[PDB]
Structure formats: structure tokens, C-alpha cells
Amino acid sequence: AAYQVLIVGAGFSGAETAFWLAQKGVRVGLLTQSLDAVMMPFLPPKPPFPPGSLLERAYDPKDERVWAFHARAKYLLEGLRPLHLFQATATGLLLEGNRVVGVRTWEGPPARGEKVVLAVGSFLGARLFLGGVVEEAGRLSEASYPDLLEDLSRLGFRFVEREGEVPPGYRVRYLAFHPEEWEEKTFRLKRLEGLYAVGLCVREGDYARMSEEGKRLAEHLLHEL
């Protein structure tokens, strides 16, 4: 129970969740497949942003470079004492009966948390259409490992198809948890115990929406603890 909350995905929703939880002293483990992609935008994030959010703090009105936004956001997360940001590729759910206690990782070492949050964005069943090529990636140059979706599918989880687009321009078709799997008020993926989901992998929205959702989840978990 080292981590009170284990979050899979250091993107706009997952990192925001980690941010507010850490501000309150919650022991958070933020697991993400690529540290070089932490909080990486598609198009440059532009105001307005949720007040006091990690998203707002990471913004620089004089620097629109998306990679720089990623770097500034990553650095901000690394400054939170109760937060441990680490690299690992989640490949499946660690279960004890009907309870999710963590995730298996491709590299081998399992990661555990009292509560497990999936904030994997557009990386489930991702297909990136760029010109005359189709890549298995949730965002430009960011590969998507098929394992997690396969595990969730094997366990019985239902998904719906969604699509996002970047004005080279490209489109990303991905899978989001079917609405019936998710309890909006608690962020619970009710099919199993101790499992939560937030962000694009459960509901559409832009950067600010992802951030607001992450904060809302953090506030809910703080109440539950």
C-alpha cells in the first residue's frame, strides 16, 4: 500500500489528478509509458485554463512550443514531494478476486495502489492516420502498446469508437470505455472493485476539460480517503 493512489498515464487528466492529490499529501504513484511524453500536447494549449491547475501553471504565453510545454509540466510534477513519477508500460490489471490492486507492466515489475486510476487517453486501440500511412499510436510519434486493451477486453470491458484530429495533419481513432462501465460521480469502472478512470479514455473533452476532470477525481478520492 505504498501508493494510496496509482495513476496510469501522465497526461492532462492523469497528471492533474496526481497534482491535486499530492498537494494534499496523498502518496501518489504516477506510472507512464514514456517520460518524454508527459503532458505532451497536440496543438499548443491556450487559455483560459482551470484556476490554479497544473495546466495553467505549465503554460507560458511567450513559448508555444508543445515539447517545451511537456518539459515544463514534467518538471512541475517532479517537484511534488508526495508524488513518484516513474516509467513503466501497463499491460494488464493486477487482480485479487474482483479487486484491482495494481497493474502488470511489460518490463516485468508490477505496480500497486490502494486505488488504481486509468488515464490512458487515446492509447487504447489507437490508429493514427497520417497521409498514406496508419500507425499504432495515440499521438504523433507516441506508440501504443496493445496489451492493456487486450487485457481489458478479455476481462469483459466494453468500448466505443471515437476519433480526434490535428489540423502535417492527422487523425487518431481510439477506444473509450463504454459509458455504462463508468460512474460519472465517482469515476468508478464498476465492473471491478478499486478501479477508476478519467479523461479521454472515458469521456471526450479538450485540455481544460481533461484538467477539470482530473481535479474532480482528486477531490472525490480525497473525500473517500
Instruction: Closer to ligand FAD by CB, 26 or 210: give it.
Output: 210
Q: Which are the contacts of 96, defined by CB distance < 8 A and separation ≥ 6?
A: none
Taking CB atoms, the residue at the shortest distance from ligand FAD is 11
Tracing cell 487515446 back to the chain, one arrives at 122
Cis-peptide into 48, omega within 30 deg: yes
Residue 45, helix vs strand vs coil: coil
Neighbours of 73 (CB within 10 A): 26
CB-side neighbour CA atoms (13 Å) of 127: 9
Instruction: Closer to ligand FAD by CB, 8 or 26: give it.
Output: 8
Instruction: Closer to ligand FAD by CB, 145 or 222: give it.
Output: 145
Question: Least CB distance from residue 85 to ligand FAD, whole Å?
Answer: 11
Question: Least CB distance from residue 22 to ligand FAD, whole Å?
Answer: 16
Q: Which are the contacts of 153, defined by CB distance < 8 A and separation ≥ 6?
A: 159
Question: Least CB distance from residue 180 to ligand FAD, whole Å?
Answer: 19
Q: What letters, b where the CB count within 10 A reaches 16 and e where it falls short, cover 188-223?
A: bbebbebbbbbbbbbbeeebbbbbbbbbbbbebbee
Which helix (DSSP H) or strand (DSSP E) does residue 105 occupy? strand 99-105
158 to 77, 153, 182: CA distances (angstroms): 32, 7, 10
Q: Which amino acid is at 181?
A: E
Instruction: Closer to ligand FAD by CB, 50 or 164: give it.
Output: 164
Tracing cell 515489475 back to the chain, one arrives at 109
Q: How many residues does the chain have?
A: 225
Which residues of this chain interact with ligand FAD, rule CB under 6 A? 8-14, 31-34, 37, 42-43, 89-90, 119-123, 138-139, 142, 145, 148, 164-166, 172, 199-201, 206-207, 210
Instruction: Closer to ligand FAD by CB, 22 or 120: give it.
Output: 120
